[model samples]
Target: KIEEGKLVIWINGDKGYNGLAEVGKKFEKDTGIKVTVEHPDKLEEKFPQVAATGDGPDIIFWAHDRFGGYAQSGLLAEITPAAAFQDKLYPFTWDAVRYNGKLIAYPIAVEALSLIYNKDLLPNPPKTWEEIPALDKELKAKGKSALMFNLQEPYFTWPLIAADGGYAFKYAAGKYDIKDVGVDNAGAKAGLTFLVDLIKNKHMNADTDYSIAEAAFNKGETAMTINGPWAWSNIDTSAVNYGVTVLPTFKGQPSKPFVGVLSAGINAASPNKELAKEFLENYLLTDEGLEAVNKDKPLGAVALKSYEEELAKDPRIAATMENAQKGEIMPNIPQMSAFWYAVRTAVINAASGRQTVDAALAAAQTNAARAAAIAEVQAALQAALNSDDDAVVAWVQAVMDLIKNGKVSEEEAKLMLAAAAAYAGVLSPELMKALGLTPEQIARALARLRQLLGLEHHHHH
Candidate 1:
């Protein structure tokens, strides 16, 4: 950590563009450090190759799962509970980092995915899941659109899945449990069928995108749209006054939206580490810092517990937090990686008449579980390198043994072994991949750390 002030950051897209700009200026004022902002929507679109070059920002603002890949790649500096600024944060807000055994990013803002409505139209966010369908019937009778769910996005179903007591992944045991991926569980099944049935019965809006629905909501053309705080800025507040709430409870249960934590993380190899830390300390993570931000943007805070005054008597934030408590956070485990694509594919197929809801969800579950394991194998090779000594060696040796034992998985095994070798400082992945391993026997190394460290079941639960 150099004392001199100099740092640069890259924020994703125009989504965090304004917030990051204002916060950047404020950070400069308080700490005398210069923050350069790069808003590249395509940067993320190209991050698979871009991030590995060590060109990422000293600090970045991103969603939980996006950063999880970065953290596992050994590119991020893990921020932890002891290092958490000011105070403790909301429990699941940083679920991505938590799933990785420590914090990778320091959260600055949290938002819940919910249904937003024009007060003049619906008057209230729904109180029950059936209420949405019920209102649909009433609206259809009048020839109006009752709900706005773009089947293109996986976000719309979060509340329904939550109401039905479902979660995408269970992380308590230090890995993703596909058996616990609740999409095929009762809640997910009910919620999913509810969506298909709504479309079949003309309850859910047929629109496939939120941008169009947001315009509709503003014009009073649609009653409600599944969305989050970002809509507050994007919506035409001047045209139609509105209210937002967690999507209604389903079948006697509470509705929980997808509550996500947006955070600031530093690149371990960046030249600007010190300046970056100082910048976050002064602007994005402080009480005064947060105050300067919320005054304009008005999303919920990342460390909400740090700024109690901002949340007091604020109904929107109150509901956001309450919803957050019951919400399912996106998981960070590399192995649970398949769910992102699985559900999205299923939703699209259902929309296009390619498959039944049951088939779509079942396929999602199966693929996600399979994909997660594959994703994990790719990730595990590199993730443990910079970590503490205990884990690094365990993970490195595990892959080596797995390979020499005839467990040579021609698919992802080579990649995993190469990554582990790089982390162990035995060789670079390029070198390992190039030179190949020395002839070695298998059983000499009995159980890899997963068996030894008890993480052997990885995602098996």
Candidate 2:
């Protein structure tokens, strides 16, 4: 056992007033480990400087699942799970910490992007992004701003783009796929386009945050907004009739929002790595730990079993939870370093009143693609078929049959599909409706989904 002395850990949190600081005190008091946490508001400004030197804190906490910059710069440490305790953890949470084959962060609180609306205003949340536009219009006609999304943050947009199968980076060989890099990919572009369309149509989405939105929404300026679990308390149901639900889906796939976890990792260069591992014992990995942290935040949790139970009790967030299962934890790839600032900046520029939506999208994609090396990406996709992984195998078969049956050549299918996906994020409902082949294509894709579900398991021709 390591010495139970005062351990100085730097947190990007307020000194005593931070929520994390409070939690850290609880941890310290319980374990007799005096934790001196220093959290400054100027994180972006100070983090880089402190992390650059070897004197950086042993354990740093932040909400972003994708810390590619810190991992790449060698500022973060790999967190290994205890052998006896590993089985208790969730796979997706484990997956969240891995970057370029090195596991950097430990899973703690998994945060996801979703919508919380007034149940009275929206009895049922829209099932698709296409539906949101109309709903917003209807709300506006009724004297509401419709919905207040963050045009400034690409977060709300990224999920819709992903549901359309657009990704900013391709994950292959435990790293980023440079070939498919950028907002240029059909899916990625489609994601951007969706946001652009919202802006172009003059939706009331602000480039600001929750405080502004909740204030506006409470005053009946807006009906709903895309916010996460952290803001759950700020909402005053007594102030107004409010309801929370999953963000709408894109295409047949759900508009999978970003899900992240609050994971604890041992310092790879720590003076006492073994003790750190034990600190995350089964108690912390149990239903108790999950429940404790998940208290104020109802829609989020780290354990799969506990998360499900929490969802069951909270009817308001159950659908959000199910829809959340479809969400992807952000991949932690070092190449994704350029993404944080670049993507946000591009979205702001595109949405700002200064530029045309189309122009903004084009400009943003151009820059993102270049920064992400989109030109050099090979556009190669992973084959989804395999007998062992029958769950996704048929999707690959359907995609392949179109090419292998000579209906379309392999290259022909790949290029068009990629083009379609890239455009899916940005395409308008009218334009998407006119795009004849998508429905047919989607039918085929669903057929593949069914095949994987074992619904077609008995249907062998």
- Evaluate residue 51 in candidate 2 and report its C-alpha lDDT on the 0 to 100 scale: 58
lDDT (Cα, tens digit) per residue for candidate 1, span 374-422: 4443445545544568666666656656656655544445444444455
**How many Å off is the CA of 276 in candidate 1?**
4.2
lDDT (Cα, tens digit) per residue for candidate 2, span 1-461: 11235444444442222443445566676876655556657654455566576554555556545366667667666665555455555666666777778677656655677777776777787777777788877887887766786656677667776776656666678876644544545665676677768767877553655467767766657777777765666676537677777777666567778676655544334565544544445434555544554453342544455555655576555645555577866656544555656666666776665665456555655555444432222122232222355433444445444444565442234334433232223223433343333555545644543444343334455
The number of the candidate with the highest lDDT is: 1
The true-versus-predicted C-alpha distance at residue 186 of model 2, in Å, is 2.3
Whole-model Cα lDDT of every candidate shown, in order: 0.64, 0.57
Q: Which candidate is the best by TM-score?
A: 1
TM-score of predicted model 2?
0.65
* TM-score per candidate: 0.71, 0.65
**Candidate 1 lDDT:** 0.64
